[PDB]
Amino acid sequence: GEVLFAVGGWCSGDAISSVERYDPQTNEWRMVASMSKRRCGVGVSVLDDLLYAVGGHDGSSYLNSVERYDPKTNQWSSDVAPTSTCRTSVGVAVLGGFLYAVGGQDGVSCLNIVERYDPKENKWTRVASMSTRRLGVAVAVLGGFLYAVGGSDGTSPLNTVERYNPQENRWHTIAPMGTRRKHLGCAVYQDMIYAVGGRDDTTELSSAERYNPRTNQWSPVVAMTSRRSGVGLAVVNGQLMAVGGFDGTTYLKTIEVFDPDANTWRLYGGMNYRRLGGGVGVIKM
Amino acid sequence: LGLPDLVAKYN
Ligand SMILES: [Cl-]
Ligand code: NA
Ligand code: NA
Ligand code: NA
Ligand code: NA
Ligand code: NA
Ligand code: NA
Ligand code: NA
Ligand code: NA
Ligand code: NA
Ligand code: NA
Ligand code: NA
Ligand code: NA
Ligand code: NA
Ligand code: NA
């Protein structure tokens, strides 16, 4: 059984330190321990059964700190080495036992740098930089590759996509999305990379699309019920769930679950708190 | 400096 954690975010002028846990078996969201820092634009993933919160922005400052949460003790610890620069609206994912931090902004520039965290050494190390600077990038891991999808180069949202080969330590550009998207959500579902929401040049998006590495093609997916920029996306007990965001008017606590058989997204009441640009992580309990 | 791109208003 898996549970999903929603971490941090932004609502109505403030960054958020609170954290909540969704239990699929009961469809209930419960508050757990808060982080030491308020963090919006926070990178979140799970490595060796610990939930990581990388960087973000606390409402006053861009952050380079990292903290991690043990569901067994319900404690956050600030015992993780910091990243080499601030990392806000950074994509974070796990590949080969390392936690990667991809893109973001440091407060002065949009980033193409990439570093990875070795939990055995408590150490971050720079690896190959991306071709493109990408704040608000989303990431996913499939077939031994780390994908960097969309983002903004500081001038415009991007439809471009690249993937990282850890054996070569090289990035390669692959097929682009049909829509430019920054602050989108990405996740692997049914061996394709799903990309949902974000903002294009003019609006928060409800649209979605998916990438098949066999064909190197993106294809449209049925749109979500709500437009959602700064949306989280994860698979929990085999179900693809979009979490929170901002629709153009309202900070969102609702969530949506994709039903591939019905080809529709189903909207649910969702979280205790509205969260734009939090992060999500999935723990196997 | 500046508000993060994620959160600054568009209107
Ligand atoms: Cl609930
Ligand atoms: Na809070
Ligand atoms: Na804080
Ligand atoms: Na700062
Ligand atoms: Na800090
Ligand atoms: Na660039
Ligand atoms: Na932009
Ligand atoms: Na390759
Ligand atoms: Na577009
Ligand atoms: Na144009
Ligand atoms: Na498409
Ligand atoms: Na609101
Ligand atoms: Na709220
Ligand atoms: Na995760
Ligand atoms: Na940002």
Author numbering:
A (entry chain A): 317 to 601
B (entry chain U): 1334 to 1344
What does the study report here?
Kelch-like protein 20 (KLHL20, also known as KLEIP) is a member of the BTB-Kelch family that assembles with CUL3 and RBX1 to form a multi-subunit Cullin-RING E3 ligase (Geyer et al., 2003, Hara et al., 2004, Pintard et al., 2004). The BTB and 3-box domains confer binding to CUL3, whereas the Kelch β-propeller domain serves as the substrate recognition domain (Canning et al., 2013, Lee et al., 2010). KLHL20 is a related CUL3-dependent ubiquitin ligase linked to autophagy, cancer, and Alzheimer's disease that promotes the ubiquitination and degradation of substrates including DAPK1, PML, and ULK1. Here, we investigated the binding of KLHL20 to DAPK1, which was the first reported substrate for this E3 ligase (Lee et al., 2010).
For further co-crystallization trials, we tried an 11-residue DAPK1 peptide (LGLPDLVAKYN) in order to capture interactions of the central “LPDLV” motif, while allowing for local conformational preferences and potential flanking interactions. The structure was refined at 1.1-Å resolution and traced the full KLHL20 Kelch domain from residues 317 to 601. The Kelch domain structure shows a canonical β-propeller fold. The bound DAPK1 peptide shows an extended conformation that packs between Kelch domain blades II and III at its N terminus and blades V and VI at its C terminus. At its center, the peptide adopts a single loose helical turn that is stabilized by intramolecular hydrogen bonds between the carbonyl of Pro1337 and the amides of Val1340 and Ala1341. Here, the peptide inserts deeply into the central cavity of the Kelch domain β propeller where it is anchored in the complex by Leu1339, the second leucine in the “LPDLV” motif. The “LPDLV” motif of DAPK lies at the core of the protein-peptide interface. Here, the hydrophobic side chains pack against Kelch domain blades I and II and make notable van der Waals contacts with KLHL20 Trp326, His373, and Leu592, respectively. By contrast, the second leucine, Leu1339, is the most buried DAPK1 residue in the complex. The final residue in the “LPDLV” motif, DAPK1 Asp1338, is oriented away from the hydrophobic side chains to face Kelch domain blade V, where it forms a salt bridge with KLHL20 Lys498 as well as a hydrogen bond to His499.
